[PDB]
Structure 1
Amino acid sequence: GNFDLASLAIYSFWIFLAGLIYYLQTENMREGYPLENEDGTPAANQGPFPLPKPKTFILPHGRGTLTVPGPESEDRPIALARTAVSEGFPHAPTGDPMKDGVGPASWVARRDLPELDGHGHNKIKPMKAAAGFHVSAGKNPIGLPVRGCDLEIAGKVVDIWVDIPEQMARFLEVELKDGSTRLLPMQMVKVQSNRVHVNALSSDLFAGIPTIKSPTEVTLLEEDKICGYVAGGLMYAAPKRKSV
């Protein structure tokens, strides 16, 4: 230092970068904190960063607001139990982890409404109800039989559910043997020339994919259950996954 301008500037920069990191870390604590013990009570050691002052997001289309930080709560039962007498070990599913939605089958209790676009219309629609939408490039999946990782057919593709504002494919709607349908995340299927293959699930697990309560829209809560369930099969359908 310090009767030199470059020295004053670099010293000042470090002070600023320390404040910036502090600010950035506290901004990143608007969700998930305070830290909890494994029983859900507040942990003793919160760290040296305090919770920031809340901010409020005004949500569009009369959906209200979100104020964070606020009271954290799962708003759903978690079918898991301890496997050790001390902290830091896994928690074993107490039933079927795919049905109970724990582990990599986990879902969050998002709003039970669909995501809306800029004009207040449902963001995701079956292509059949999406005026003017059509497949523009690539193999069209509609009509292909759907194969699970047990190398067995679980059903047939009956539509693509599309993101209207982003003009992209988000799910395949798949008809099962009983005539009902399910949604499969597009990120979890492989469209092949003569089939759609689903590595994550064996055929017998398709029935258990969480259903949507109205056939022409999907809610944020429903997306989370479907995507959770399908992801969970990488781990939990592993015994039925023939080598490939």
Structure 2
Amino acid sequence: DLASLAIYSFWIFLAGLIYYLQTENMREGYPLENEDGTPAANQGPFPLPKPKTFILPHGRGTLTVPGPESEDRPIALARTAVSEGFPHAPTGDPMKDGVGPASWVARRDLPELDGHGHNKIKPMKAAAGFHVSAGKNPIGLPVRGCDLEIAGKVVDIWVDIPEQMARFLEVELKDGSTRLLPMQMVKVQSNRVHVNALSSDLFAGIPTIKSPTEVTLLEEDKICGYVAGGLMYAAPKRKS
């Protein structure tokens, strides 16, 4: 019967599809590890796929995955139990150490480029023809942490040029230096910007950028990591 053939065949196909799909999704993070970072004994029944290479634009090279995995950074954590499966306690200050929900990845310390090879994210002051078009302009608002104190003031928006969207607020601190705050982690209010994730005393510890008119992917990850980490680790100084 032709329909029985068609459906029997379909299942075989779908089984192969799921296999393919699952192996394609092991191109990062595998082989699996023990908690000391050595290779685990039980890797699962799906083998790692044959590698593929992405050619990256703008002379930035290639990425071949799967490949040798490696954190390329220290991880300030220690076991809290004598067996597998328990949490790992920060050995210092987790916000400073970039562990836990304050974690960052050792991405390239270069900026994301656009299609023309220009920096993707620029402060609006340096972004020809870019201006706030709708909504409350943050620039000039005082910035408030979850301790209900003022940590600083908004001095610019950092904008994605090709996608024409706001990505960070640049905030000047009491000492005159600035930091970036992810736009996704701030509430622009009529008369302030409020930052739930961080108490005012924690703003100085936001990682800083090495050149004041661009950010690197490494720098983004540290900044975004740090600020998200506050949800867990600033909670004592939070009053919500």
Scaled by the length of structure 2, the TM-score of the pair is 1.00
Structure 1 distance, partners of 2:62, 2:199, is 41
Deviation track 1:91-110 (CA, whole Å, cap 9, x = no partner) reads 00000000000000000000
User: Are 2:39 and 1:42 aligned?
Assistant: yes
Pick one of 24, 28, 33 that aligns with 1:27: 24
Structure 2 distance, partners of 1:216, 1:235, is 30
The Cα shift of 1:170 comes to 0.0
The Cα shift of 1:75 comes to 0.1
The Cα shift of 1:183 comes to 0.1
Sequence identity, in percent?
A: 100
Q: Which runs of 5+ in 1 are unaligned?
A: none
The Cα shift of 1:121 comes to 0.1
Deviation track 1:86-129 (CA, whole Å, cap 9, x = no partner) reads 00000000000000000000000000000000000000000000
Structure 1 distance, partners of 2:234, 2:144, is 14
The Cα shift of 1:194 comes to 0.2
Deviation track 1:170-225 (CA, whole Å, cap 9, x = no partner) reads 00000000000000000000000000000000000000000000000000000000
User: Are 2:180 and 1:183 aligned?
Assistant: yes
Structure 1 distance, partners of 2:120, 2:66, is 28
Structure 1 distance, partners of 2:20, 2:42, is 20
Task: State the match for 2:2 in structure 1.
Answer: 5
C-alpha RMSD of matched pairs (Å)? 0.2
Task: State the match for 1:209 in structure 2.
Answer: 206
Structure 1 distance, partners of 2:160, 2:201, is 29
Structure 2 distance, partners of 1:21, 1:43, is 24
Task: State the match for 2:192 in structure 1.
Answer: 195
Deviation track 1:155-183 (CA, whole Å, cap 9, x = no partner) reads 00000000000000000000000000000
Structure 2 distance, partners of 1:172, 1:71, is 36
Pick one of 104, 109, 132 that aligns with 2:106: 109
Q: In the comparison of the two structures, how many residue pairs are matched? A: 240
Structure 1 distance, partners of 2:198, 2:215, is 21
Structure 2 distance, partners of 1:210, 1:75, is 18
Structure 2 distance, partners of 1:81, 1:72, is 21
Structure 2 distance, partners of 1:13, 1:165, is 43
The Cα shift of 1:146 comes to 0.1
Structure 2 distance, partners of 1:53, 1:67, is 10
Structure 1 distance, partners of 2:39, 2:130, is 50
The Cα shift of 1:242 comes to 0.8
The Cα shift of 1:13 comes to 0.1
Deviation track 1:33-63 (CA, whole Å, cap 9, x = no partner) reads 0000000000000000000000000000000
SS in 2 for 1:224: helix
Structure 2 distance, partners of 1:218, 1:159, is 14
Structure 2 distance, partners of 1:54, 1:157, is 46
Structure 1 distance, partners of 2:13, 2:81, is 45
Q: Which runs of 4+ in 1 moved over 6 A?
A: none
Scaled by the length of structure 1, the TM-score of the pair is 0.98
